[PDB]
Amino acid sequence: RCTTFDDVQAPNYTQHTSSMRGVYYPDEIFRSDTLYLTQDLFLPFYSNVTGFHTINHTFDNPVIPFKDGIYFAATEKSNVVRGWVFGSTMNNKSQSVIIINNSTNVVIRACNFELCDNPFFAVSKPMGTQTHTMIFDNAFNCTFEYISDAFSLDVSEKSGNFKHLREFVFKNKDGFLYVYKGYQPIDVVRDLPSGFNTLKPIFKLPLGINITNFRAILTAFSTWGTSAAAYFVGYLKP
Amino acid sequence: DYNYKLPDDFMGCVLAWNTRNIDATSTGNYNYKYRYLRHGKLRPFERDISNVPFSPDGKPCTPPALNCYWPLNDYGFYTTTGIGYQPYRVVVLSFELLNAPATVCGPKLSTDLIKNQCVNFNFNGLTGTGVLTPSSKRFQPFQQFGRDVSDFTDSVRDPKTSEILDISPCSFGGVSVITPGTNASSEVAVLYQDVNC
Numbered sequence: 001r002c003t004t005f006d007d008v009q010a011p012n013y014t015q016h017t018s019s020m021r022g023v024y025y026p027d028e029i030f031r032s033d034t035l036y037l038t039q040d041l042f043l044p045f046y047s048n049v050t051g052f053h054t055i056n057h058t059f060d061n062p063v064i065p066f067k068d069g070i071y072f073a074a075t076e077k078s079n080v081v082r083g084w085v086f087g088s089t090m091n092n093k094s095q096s097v098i099i100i101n102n103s104t105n106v107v108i109r110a111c112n113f114e115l116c117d118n119p120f121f122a123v124s125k126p127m128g129t130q131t132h133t134m135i136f137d138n139a140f141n142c143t144f145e146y147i148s149d150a151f152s153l154d155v156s157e158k159s160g161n162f163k164h165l166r167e168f169v170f171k172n173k174d175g176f177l178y179v180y181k182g183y184q185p186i187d188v189v190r191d192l193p194s195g196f197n198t199l200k201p202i203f204k205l206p207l208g209i210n211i212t213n214f215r216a217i218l219t220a221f222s223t224w225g226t227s228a229a230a231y232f233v234g235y236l237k238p
Numbered sequence: 239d240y241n242y243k244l245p246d247d248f249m250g251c252v253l254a255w256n257t258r259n260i261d262a263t264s265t266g267n268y269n270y271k272y273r274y275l276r277h278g279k280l281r282p283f284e285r286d287i288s289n290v291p292f293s294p295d296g297k298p299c300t301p302p303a304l305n306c307y308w309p310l311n312d313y314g315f316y317t318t319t320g321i322g323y324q325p326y327r328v329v330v331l332s333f334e335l336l337n338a339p340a341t342v343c344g345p346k347l348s349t350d351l352i353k354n355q356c357v358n359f360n361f362n363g364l365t366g367t368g369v370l371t372p373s374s375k376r377f378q379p380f381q382q383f384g385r386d387v388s389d390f391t392d393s394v395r396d397p398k399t400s401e402i403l404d405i406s407p408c409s410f411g412g413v414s415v416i417t418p419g420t421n422a423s424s425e426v427a428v429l430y431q432d433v434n435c
């Protein structure tokens with residue numbers, strides 16, 4: 001169902017610096033103690049990364065343009081930002097892959113989804129349990145189907161600095177959505193922290209879909225509330 | 239090609255065959271369509287299933303208004319037509335040169351690996367030759383070819399046993415030959431192998 005909350009506060013677009021991030025293994029080739037040049041889509045050092053800070057009033061998930069490839073980060077201690085849509089017009093006619101984790105397993109399923117303007121997970125704030133999902137209702141003319149390997153996830157509220165930091169890279173390239181992954185522990189309130197971290201591939205998804213826009217999917221803590229958890233979006237350039 | 243684009247970079251096999259008997263019905267075959275108008279072009283291995291009502295300017299439409307066309311074509315067939323208008327079922331076999339753990343074999347029986355120098359090793363996509371030798375190289379599990387300074391594959395993780403081994407080539411070099419005077423003596427020219435003995 002297309003349930004939108006009433007008070008939707010606009011993002012202030014607090015820019016941050018992609019200090020030493022967005023570096024991934026460019027190919028499946030082991031190289032030992034060498035210097036190697038690469039012409040590929042990378043995140044440039046010290047680029048403008050649009051922050052998205054979620055507070056009790058601010059609910060950050062705009063329809064962000066994809067533009068040849070994105071970097072993604074998410075400062076987490078409650079693992080809130082679990083979910084990615086990659087659509088053309090974010091409506092029913094266009095093709096949209098939906099990469100989501102429903103806290104037991106990651107499910108990738110591309111179809112012609114009637115995208116709601118406000119996807120959310122009805123999770124209680126003191127309890128911290130996923131009750132339902134209302135992301136998709138109709139799925140006609142479905143292309144792609146995938147279910148990954150299972151792993152546990154914690155949902156409930158914490159308070160303080162961030163323990164987790166999921167760092168993702170999405171490249172649309174000949175219809176193959178290359179997805180990368182890295183992780184390191186941090187300690188920060190709102191800034192995308194400076195530091196070097198290398199990302200590793202997980203999915204070469206044979207989609208073949210027009211990806212021009214995207215939107216993350218948030219875990220609301222239910223009249224709504226969100227815990228302190230920010231995410232970051234950069235752009236990849238050749 | 240404006241509907242299905244195959245790139246110059248990545249490439250596979252294109253397979254077409256005639257279906258005058260099956261698809262080319264004598265009365266018509268209007269199950270198959272294709273777009274003939276679209277804003278811009280399509281990227282390779284990328285398509286648009288959606289039946290968006292086309293306009294040349296970019297405004298949304300409702301047909302049959304001025305310059306509001308449907309993108310799809312009434313693309314019929316008849317068995318009485320010529321060979322140039324017959325339907326052809328085309329299967330495009332794109333491959334992966336991106337050497338992940340392999341799927342297709344094209345089956346040969348797989349022998350046992352040996353530490354012996356000079357083996358014609360044929361791994362998944364490496365028809366090289368050389369010296370299989372086990373190595374202490376680390377290999378994060380999403381990479382399985384090792385290269386050292388250049389083009390040549392230095393080390394491979396074995397596809398059966400996941401054993402990490404580096405490849406040395408067949409121990410080549412130049413042969414040099416000492417001779418004294420052939421008028422002095424035709425006695426044995428002693429040699430060089432620029433190799434471990």
Ligand SMILES: *[C@@H]1O[C@H](CO)[C@@H](O)[C@H](O)[C@H]1NC(C)=O
Nearest residue numbers: 013014015016046047048049
């Ligand atoms: C975006 O980055 C450019 C340099 O790449 C910089 O000049 C500009 O000030 C940045 N925009 C901000 C910080 O809003």
Ligand SMILES: *[C@@H]1O[C@H](CO)[C@@H](O)[C@H](O)[C@H]1NC(C)=O
Nearest residue numbers: 101102103104105106107147
């Ligand atoms: C949602 O979770 C179930 C089990 O909890 C599992 O099948 C999968 O991770 C998801 N199923 C979907 C998205 O249909």
Ligand SMILES: *[C@@H]1O[C@H](CO)[C@@H](O)[C@H](O)[C@H]1NC(C)=O
Nearest residue numbers: 112140141142271287288289
């Ligand atoms: C799905 O797409 C096919 C063509 O690809 C079309 O014939 C069919 O009507 C579509 N389904 C709908 C619009 O429900």
Ligand SMILES: *[C@@H]1O[C@H](CO)[C@@H](O)[C@H](O)[C@H]1NC(C)=O
Nearest residue numbers: 088089210212278279280281
């Ligand atoms: C994707 O679709 C949008 C509008 O639906 C269009 O502007 C854009 O050119 C398309 N991209 C490609 C690569 O076809």
Ligand SMILES: *[C@@H]1O[C@H](CO)[C@@H](O)[C@H](O)[C@H]1NC(C)=O
Nearest residue numbers: 348349396397398399400401
């Ligand atoms: C299959 O793989 C396992 C390890 O992944 C290996 O121990 C086993 O020998 C392989 N099977 C055969 C028939 O070699």
